Design an enzyme around this catalytic site. Structure first.
Site: not given
Ligand SMILES: C[C@H]1O[C@H](O[C@H]2[C@H](O)[C@@H](O)[C@@H](O)O[C@@H]2CO)[C@H](O)[C@@H](O)[C@@H]1N[C@H]1C=C(CO)[C@@H](O[C@H]2O[C@H](CO)[C@@H](O[C@H]3O[C@H](CO)[C@@H](O)[C@H](O)[C@H]3O)[C@H](O)[C@H]2O)[C@H](O)[C@H]1O
Ligand SMILES: [Cl-]
Ligand SMILES: *[C@@H]1O[C@H](CO)[C@@H](O)[C@H](O)[C@H]1NC(C)=O
Ligand SMILES: [Ca+2]
Length: 496
Positions: A197, A233
């Site tokens: 992840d 990822e």
């Molecule tokens: C969801 C993905 O976000 C990133 O992707 C970015 C791209 O890399 C960039 O190129 C461009 O396109 O923008 C996107 C979006 O920013 C990461 O790179 C990617 O790794 C990530 N996907 C994976 C990892 C995470 C984190 O473990 C997962 O996110 C989910 O979980 C988080 C944590 O609960 C959640 O966030 C929520 O909690 C935080 C707590 O601090 C709050 O601040 C936030 O407002 C909450 O929404 C994310 O929303 C959720 O997507 C994801 O599932 C993985 O697949």
């Molecule tokens: Cl994935």
């Protein structure tokens, strides 16, 4: 790290998103093994924060509290039971490893975790691991907010907090060892690999250092010298300084351009046509096939949380989705991952779904069991796309034609195309607003074949459409634009 470690003859893994361990265990035995599925990607098995606002969202599982195998999916005993039972029937398990960070820095300290572990984000205290303040990148990050603010700066993308998630100091041997301790525990239990992840948020070298501490797969099920399958990822759609190729030395990478481009062509957006797919693959700027993990949609972008945008196809767009998934597992490029989701009350306001946080079907927070209907579909709001005839039969189609080359391509210059896989399979698509009726060269041996999209081959008979291949390999195909599935697929094992 590049080989899936799947049983010989199985070419796909399925993501049983938010499924409980007991449900996955019997699914391995009752469906996945006999239907030829190679493996299962499970949701994070480690303890996470229990978020009640909103109520138990799916993303709470991406906020670790400890490495204890204790979640809404089940406990360590249930997890071990699932891995053993699945391996015993030849279905592998791949774990979603959340190792880039811990939970949000703003979460309240206490015991609101999947099983009482105490934690204090404010003071960087995670006693159940244990982790302390000097185990995070707080002093390394250089942004004013402490969070990632600009993806154009490769340094902050790795050293700062992704949406506030406490960033682990992966350069420290202690931290590397605690993560390896966790992954080796899983490996020794029997897991065949991992989805790393948020790999983009980790330095390729730090990831490599951790992988160097991993054991070989459990010798009770895998041959000596087997290395865990690793898929990272990394969202790389082309405009950032970080490239997915930077991670080729650690294992495979998720190819997000795949689903994004496929959705646009199948939706026929901005003039795209299926005829343009003749050179699908590296020709479209994708990573090398042997380093790619492909999919149509994932748990993030099927609900607008990742990358791919509005072009991404999902179970909500059933007709076009089946076509996309069908083209993917018929095509030789990459290692395929099929998605399996749950239904949620999608509420689109101003073009955005306000219920994109809703977690798995449940009763007071307790995840509902996956029930199976007499027609083999699922109840309790589980979509089970892997159980749809059109998808399940294409999963088998990929197994049957494994290793066969891409050949006998045909296209009408628009959205009617076809191609075969050596002499073991042939597939035809009609995505135009008119009928398709033509005799094509299939490269298959003469005989009567059952179309595996409209039906099945049961008791020496076809329940759906039947295709007749002549001595010269030719066969007539007829697909109306009004068909409930505008594509036909036949293979060596569907021959009558
Ligand atoms: C969801 C993905 O976000 C990133 O992707 C970015 C791209 O890399 C960039 O190129 C461009 O396109 O923008 C996107 C979006 O920013 C990461 O790179 C990617 O790794 C990530 N996907 C994976 C990892 C995470 C984190 O473990 C997962 O996110 C989910 O979980 C988080 C944590 O609960 C959640 O966030 C929520 O909690 C935080 C707590 O601090 C709050 O601040 C936030 O407002 C909450 O929404 C994310 O929303 C959720 O997507 C994801 O599932 C993985 O697949
Ligand atoms: Cl994935
Ligand atoms: C196939 O179905 C027909 C009836 O449609 C039946 O006559 C025939 O016996 C079936 N073949 C086999 C092998 O069962
Ligand atoms: Ca990081």
């Amino acid at each position: 790290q590049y080989s899936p470690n799947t049983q010989q003859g199985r070419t796909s893994i399925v993501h049983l998103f938010e499924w409980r361990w007991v449900d996955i265990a019997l699914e391995c035995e009752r469906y996945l093994a006999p239907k030829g599925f190679g493996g299962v990607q499970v949701s994070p098995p480690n303890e996470n924060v229990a978020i009640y606002n909103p109520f138990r969202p799916w993303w709470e599982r991406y906020q670790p509290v400890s490495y204890k195998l204790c979640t809404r999916s089940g406990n360590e005993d249930e997890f071990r039971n699932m891995v053993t039972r699945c391996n015993n029937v030849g279905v592998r398990i791949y774990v979603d490893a959340v190792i880039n960070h811990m939970c949000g820095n703003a979460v309240s300290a206490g015991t609101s975790s999947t099983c009482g572990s105490y934690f204090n984000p404010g003071s960087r205290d995670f006693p159940a691991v244990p982790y302390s303040g000097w185990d995070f990148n707080d002093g390394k990050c250089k942004t004013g907010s402490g969070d990632i603010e600009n993806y154009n700066d490769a340094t902050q993308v790795r050293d700062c907090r992704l949406t506030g998630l406490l960033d682990l100091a992966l350069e420290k041997d202690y931290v590397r060892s605690k993560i390896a301790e966790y992954m080796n525990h899983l490996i020794d239990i029997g897991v065949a690999g991992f989805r790393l992840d948020a790999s983009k948020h980790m330095w390729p070298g730090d990831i490599k250092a951790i992988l160097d501490k991993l054991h070989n797969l459990n010798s009770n099920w895998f041959p000596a010298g087997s290395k865990p399958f690793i898929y990272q990822e990394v969202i790389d759609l082309g405009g950032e300084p970080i490239k997915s190729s930077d991670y080729f030395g650690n294992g495979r990478v998720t190819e997000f351009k795949y689903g994004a481009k496929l959705g646009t062509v199948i939706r026929k957006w901005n003039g795209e046509k299926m005829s343009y797919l003749k050179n699908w693959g590296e020709g479209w700027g994708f990573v090398p096939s042997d380093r790619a993990l492909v999919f149509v949609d994932n748990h993030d972008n099927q609900r607008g949380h990742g990358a791919g945008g509005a072009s991404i196809l999902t179970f909500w767009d059933a007709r076009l989705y089946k076509m996309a998934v069908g083209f993917m597992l018929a095509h030789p490029y990459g290692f395929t991952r099929v998605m399996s989701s749950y239904r949620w009350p999608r509420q689109f306001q101003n073009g955005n779904d306000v219920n994109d946080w809703v977690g798995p079907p449940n009763n007071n927070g307790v995840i509902k069991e996956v029930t199976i209907n007499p027609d083999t579909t699922c109840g309790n709001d589980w979509v089970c796309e892997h159980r749809w005839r059109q998808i399940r039969n294409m999963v088998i189609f990929r197994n049957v034609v494994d290793g066969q080359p891409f050949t006998n391509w045909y296209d009408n210059g628009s959205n009617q195309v076809a191609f075969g896989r050596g002499n073991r399979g042939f597939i035809v698509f009609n995505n135009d607003d008119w009928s398709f009726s033509l005799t094509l060269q299939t490269g298959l041996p003469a005989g009567t074949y059952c179309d595996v999209i409209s039906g099945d081959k049961i008791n020496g008979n076809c329940t759906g459409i039947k295709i007749y291949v002549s001595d010269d390999g030719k066969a007539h195909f007829s697909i109306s634009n009004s068909a409930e599935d505008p594509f036909i697929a036949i293979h060596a094992e569907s021959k009558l």
